[PDB]
Amino acid sequence: DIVLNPLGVPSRMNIGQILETHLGMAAKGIGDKINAMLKQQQEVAKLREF
Amino acid sequence: HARSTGSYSLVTQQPLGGKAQFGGQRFGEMEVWALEAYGAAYTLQEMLTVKSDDVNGRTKMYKNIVDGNHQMEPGMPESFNVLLKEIRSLGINIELEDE
Amino acid sequence: EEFDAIKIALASPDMIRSWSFGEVKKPETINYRTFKPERDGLFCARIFGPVKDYECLCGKYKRLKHRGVICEKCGVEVTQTKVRRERMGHIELASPTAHIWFLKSLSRIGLLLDMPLRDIERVLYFESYVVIEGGMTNLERQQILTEEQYLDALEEFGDEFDAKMGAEAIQALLKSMDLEQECEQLREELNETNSETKRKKLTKRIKLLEAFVQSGNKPEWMILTVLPVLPPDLRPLVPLDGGRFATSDLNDLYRRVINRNNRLKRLLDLAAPDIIVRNEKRMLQEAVDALLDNGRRGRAITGSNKRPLKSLADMIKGKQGRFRQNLLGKRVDYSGRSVITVGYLRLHQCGLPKKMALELFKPFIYGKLELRGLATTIKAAKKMVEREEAVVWDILDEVIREHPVLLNRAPTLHRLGIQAFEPVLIEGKAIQLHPLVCAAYNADFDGDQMAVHVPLTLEAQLEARALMMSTNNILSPANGEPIIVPSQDVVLGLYYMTRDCVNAKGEGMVLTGPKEAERLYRSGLASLHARVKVRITEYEKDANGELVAKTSLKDTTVGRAILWMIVPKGLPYSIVNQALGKKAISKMLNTCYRILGLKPTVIFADQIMYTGFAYAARSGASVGIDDMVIPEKKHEIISEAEAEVAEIQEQFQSGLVTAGERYNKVIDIWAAANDRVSKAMMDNLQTETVINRDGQEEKQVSFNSIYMMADSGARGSAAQIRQLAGMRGLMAKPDGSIIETPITANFREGLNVLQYFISTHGARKGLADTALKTANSGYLTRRLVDVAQDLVVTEDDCGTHEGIMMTPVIEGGDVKEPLRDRVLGRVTAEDVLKPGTADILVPRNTLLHEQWCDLLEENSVDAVKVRSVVSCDTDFGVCAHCYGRDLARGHIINKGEAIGVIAAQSIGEPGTQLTMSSIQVKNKGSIKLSNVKSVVNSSGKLVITSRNTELKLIDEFGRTKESYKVPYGAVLAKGDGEQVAGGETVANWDPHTMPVITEVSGFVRFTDMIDGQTITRQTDELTGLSSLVVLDSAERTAGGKDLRPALKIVDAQGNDVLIPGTDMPAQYFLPGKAIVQLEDGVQISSGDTLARIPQGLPRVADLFEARRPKEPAILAEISGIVSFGKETKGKRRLVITPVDGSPYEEMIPKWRQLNVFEGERVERGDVISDGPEAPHDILRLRGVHAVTRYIVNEVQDVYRLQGVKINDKHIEVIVRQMLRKATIVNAGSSDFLEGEQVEYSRVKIANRELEANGKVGATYSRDLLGITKASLATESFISAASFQETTRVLTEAAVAGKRDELRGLKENVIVGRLIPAGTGYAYHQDRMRRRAAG
Amino acid sequence: ARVTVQDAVEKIGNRFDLVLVAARRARQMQVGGKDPLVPEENDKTTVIALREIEEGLINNQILDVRERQEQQEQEAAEL
Amino acid sequence: GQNMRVAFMPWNGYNFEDSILVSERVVQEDRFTTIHIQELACVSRDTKL
């Protein structure tokens, strides 16, 4: 839903935004797996373990 | 913001500034340098003659614009008359040397 | 109505009474119950006019029933309310009071009366008497008097003498003075004594009195007797919405003055004691002074809010005065403001939102609706546009069409800040902007606002379309390079698509056209970057205006074939057969413009932008964390640096190395480690791509996105990747020293807390300088453009004589700007001929375009006489042939435009960007010596005995390649005319030991060497070869210091050995710090020594300010022998004894090293004392050409250091206006030494030596001022009064009685007339022919 | 022409004279009701003058003759 | 503020100089929708008329 220019990263010296992007993607992937498995309700203990 | 014809000041009768009170942009000093560098005398003459400082100039401009005739009639700026009166009241004589 | 000039003078009481329609007596201003003004108050409707249009106070005469009758019930005349803005009033002052401008401004009455200011101030304060006239000889005129001896005079004489106090005394003094007697007396007595300290003051006295003579301006009007008052409208007391009032402090000042005036009126007839009358007069004077200028003479009179009250002078001066914020720059109508946004638009189209479109052109909508007949009346049209019906949009779609609109972005640095675009209606809120123009605006899409203006009249539309359209503006006025270069994304796409990959797809396939190549790419059967064979038909215009085609087959990548659909049938294929970087695109755009034309250039640029955006979108490039590679040697280099860091720390703690040496070693090793890390970074980043194609392995150019964005120049640089992935160098703490502990880590690995804290120092300092110095940049721009007001072309060619010699900048280092570009666009001043004699290319004037430049660079020409702006002989302007061709258009400049404003903007715009022993030959050539006093040393080699010699490297053609400086008494390992290769140490000299080497050979016996009075006996404690020691004045005995210790050369018989070929004696004089090497009895040969003598933005602002350097270099004004006279009396003295002329003597600092001695001969304009040089001295000794070259080179150095290119012609034009004053030394038509204008002197001598008169005129000398003084010292007074120090120029033009013919640009800008530039010139030529014809 | 004004300047000789001559032509073209000697082909008021001076039909020397014959014939009609 | 997906890719020049390209979905679901409250004052006085 959001498109940003890539050339604005290097000269601006702000690299932490790339790490933040990767961290956010990883967090959303974890949450996506959590909700995907939640729709089927395998086991309360399985959710606890995960 | 966008102004066509609105308020005018009291002492110098220029259009005011600020969106909240509906006033026009300030045609700053540097863009005058740029425009006179270009060489478009008429454009800056309109900018500082018929837009802000002519009581009977802008009225005639509006009238004949509504009449479909975009003809310009010049006039002495009011902010120059106030300057003349002030400098005369300061005690220094000043006259407009007519032909 | 129409006028010709403006008149300024003093106001006599007669006309101050004439102007006023009445006089005020009542301090009241308005009623409280009602709101009608009172009689003879500050708002009296009788005096100033009716409050409401065509109405009287009571109602007897109204509604134009009586046109101009005066209502007898009240006494007011019925007319418009505009007369209130013009009617004036006066107040009769019971006691005369002194004007403040002519008292504190430096004095204009102090000189006129020749009295000290303190005495006048004492007299005005009722403290000391002044004798207007004394019958007896005991007293005399203008003698200050204390009370006790005043009473003594009263009892001694009484009525015989006349003395009194107050401003009445000053008025009587002015009355008693006779101007003509002083005029004839001071002028005559001035010539009797040449007291140079008093010549200037006497000349000023004579000038002031003669101005009073021929101005018709009596000094009696200097003291105010009746005071004018401002019209009520300009000092409005108007009601507020909340039932309160607000008024100007002028009302308070007038109330105070009138109150104490009538109080003094009552006290005068109350016969009160004179003490109270003196007090009341003092306070009357104080009040009138406060009214004229509050915070000038005493304590500023504050108001109810404990703030100083704004006097009417404060309303006319400063940044807040009427001149700057209300006359030059004004608020404007028919404008709007919005936020900026990006667009697919054409180059001449701007996205205007619909909501503001109807608001701006609303009067046009009313008119079009009236003419179209859908609206019966104007207010019906107003209702319709309020209802925004579809018809109003139907009108809008064509009302805006073909109607340009001006766009502005504050601040407007240079001429390109205002651009005319064709509007295109868009449904949104923000102004859409074509991306290519952004670089022209220096605007980035991060919330920056934009202003939109609309021209009304047909002339304005024509000017906007023909002159202000963005298509017309491609090249900078500063220099001819393009401004429409694609910034970051188009170049990225082009650099991506014009690439070569060795193993991509379908490589080697042979094709016959670009169209099927693009269909292959769209089908995906062939990669974008793949080597193929393509058939291409290109064109050339070798014939005289005809295009001829050639078809061939070339090996190229797919993208270079696709791009061929864009080139407009006029460029060779080789121009699109590269990687297409930033510089490639810029230079190919320039070539396309200079070969084909203008419209194909803009069409080609638009298509380039479209295709670049499209393929940049098609490709896809991102910034991943893995792209930030880290070389594996970083920590190894860190360890291999800290090892010797600890080693150096241990050495320092041992004590065998000093702190400074340790600092130098550690900074050097850290710099070496940083260089190694950066080299590893670039090695890992530039050729990281290793790929195989039907082979083993090959390294190609990197496919990393970071390398693509760095190499192509779209954004950033390879130096930035050093801090991106490597250690962030070393930074300097704000004191000035550089921290020896660097930031070994990088952004990718993160930082330590203390590392970030250290970097914050540099970050905050960098922010601070940017935040501060832009104000100095703006002030510099204002001062530059102020003096560059009226530089407009008046003629095409004045037919002047030779101008300025031109040379490349090979001096110092490598050739930075060759003759190719430094003369491109100039016009020669003489018949320049090729190195082959009698081969002339120019009839003393031609336009040096690229072809003539190629012809001359093919030849070995190195110097040309070109026509300069300063050398122009045109009066009140410059001619085109003295100036050169335009840079915005490329052709010769046509008359009408203004050069000063554009040049000042060009040199002021980059201001915000520029905030901050042996000689080795480098290349093969012939060694030449310039102005050499050659001599042969004891070893037979060539050595130098002068300071004015330079080393030159002549190539095989004859033109010099390198230039170097060789000092006096140096040793050279080569002679003159030696053709030697580079890499050899040719010249050698001790950095400290300055020899006194003898050019002749003979016996050396110690002469004039008396021990115990001039020299001391000291011997070397190790070698023993020593002689008598000569020290400076502070260390040697004063008994023998009268004579300079001279060591002449003698022979066996004991006679002086004269110079070979000359009868002048040859002896040397020994200054201080001179210890003779050889002993007595021994001799030296030629070239051997006798005694060894051991040894940003403001930087460009001070040159235009003509600041005197702290230690100016002293030069000689005449030739001849240099000798020394007075010794050690405050400062030394230097005599000059020329061949036939005079004893020119002046103070010389003995504490500074000299270049010559007692026995030397020096010509005029030569370096005697070292150090920085004063431009005033350069102009005084050498011609204007020298100072022009000095200024242009010095200013160009700073701009070169920051990598900003400016055509030189934009600099000396200011110098052209910088050299405008002259000082007379002769007589015949003017005073003895008054300053005037050099063109005025030229028009004075244009008849004094011509047929009108044989020879009576005077000879002059050019003068150089500061930029501000030159701006102020002009013929017009409004031009100076609109810039700075308005009070001083006003008060001097008043007494001078000047008039201004309205020649300058800003003069007509203030007056509202047409500005004499472009079309305004075409109008003023008609007006001047009219006034010539009467 | 319409977007560029190159070939008109040769018929005139200067950049600052083309605006004046175009304005003087368009004045009588609009308020004087004069039919432009260039075909209109759906063009606005201040562009047909530019096109006409591109094809070079008017000039200051010949813009001052047809305005004098009309006034002399008007005076003949009155007298 | 909010948090959403983001890709670093130059799209047709609509992100030419630090500009932001936005999707219709975020406007559909009102992620950045804000609320503004203003106050207007009408004053009644006793004028001499």
XYZ file of N, CA and C in Angstrom, chain C residues 38 177 226 253 373 410 418 424 431 476 489 492 527 553 603 632 647 675 693 795 1145 1169 1193 1197 1252 1328:
78
model
N -13.367 67.914 16.874
C -13.579 69.255 17.393
C -12.934 70.301 16.486
N 25.511 85.862 9.336
C 26.534 85.356 8.431
C 26.305 85.852 7.009
N 7.704 77.297 12.343
C 6.345 76.772 12.292
C 6.416 75.342 11.772
N 2.836 62.303 20.046
C 3.891 63.303 19.898
C 3.316 64.681 19.600
N -23.782 35.772 -22.606
C -25.204 36.033 -22.507
C -25.985 35.139 -21.572
N 9.665 31.080 -2.915
C 10.479 31.863 -1.998
C 11.498 30.966 -1.298
N 11.369 32.715 -11.129
C 10.037 33.008 -11.643
C 9.893 32.323 -12.992
N -2.859 23.763 -16.561
C -3.648 22.585 -16.889
C -4.506 22.277 -15.672
N -0.353 22.240 -6.183
C 0.193 22.643 -7.473
C 1.094 21.526 -7.979
N 21.786 28.845 -17.902
C 21.914 29.827 -16.836
C 22.415 31.159 -17.390
N 16.188 10.076 -10.963
C 15.530 8.830 -11.344
C 15.655 8.535 -12.834
N 18.976 7.233 -13.311
C 19.031 5.865 -12.805
C 18.508 4.876 -13.839
N 16.934 -10.109 -23.181
C 17.165 -9.258 -22.023
C 17.424 -7.816 -22.447
N 25.667 -1.319 -39.676
C 25.398 -2.351 -38.687
C 26.405 -2.212 -37.555
N 11.638 18.662 -26.860
C 10.907 17.428 -27.146
C 11.746 16.215 -26.764
N 36.336 -7.659 4.852
C 36.766 -8.516 5.950
C 38.059 -8.044 6.599
N 51.952 1.730 20.616
C 53.401 1.901 20.560
C 53.788 3.368 20.716
N 42.356 5.480 4.748
C 42.563 5.320 3.313
C 42.555 3.850 2.916
N 30.651 -17.052 -18.450
C 29.889 -17.244 -19.680
C 30.758 -18.016 -20.660
N 24.376 51.159 -26.417
C 24.852 51.088 -27.790
C 25.196 49.641 -28.119
N 59.683 60.595 0.364
C 59.978 59.904 1.607
C 58.680 59.537 2.309
N 58.102 45.842 0.445
C 57.673 45.149 1.648
C 56.704 44.037 1.274
N 40.765 37.178 -10.469
C 41.460 35.951 -10.094
C 41.207 35.592 -8.633
N 39.260 32.176 -7.442
C 39.877 31.107 -6.659
C 38.877 30.489 -5.688
N 35.803 73.416 -28.893
C 35.177 74.425 -28.043
C 36.205 75.245 -27.273
N 12.839 60.345 -24.499
C 14.019 61.195 -24.593
C 14.061 61.946 -25.917
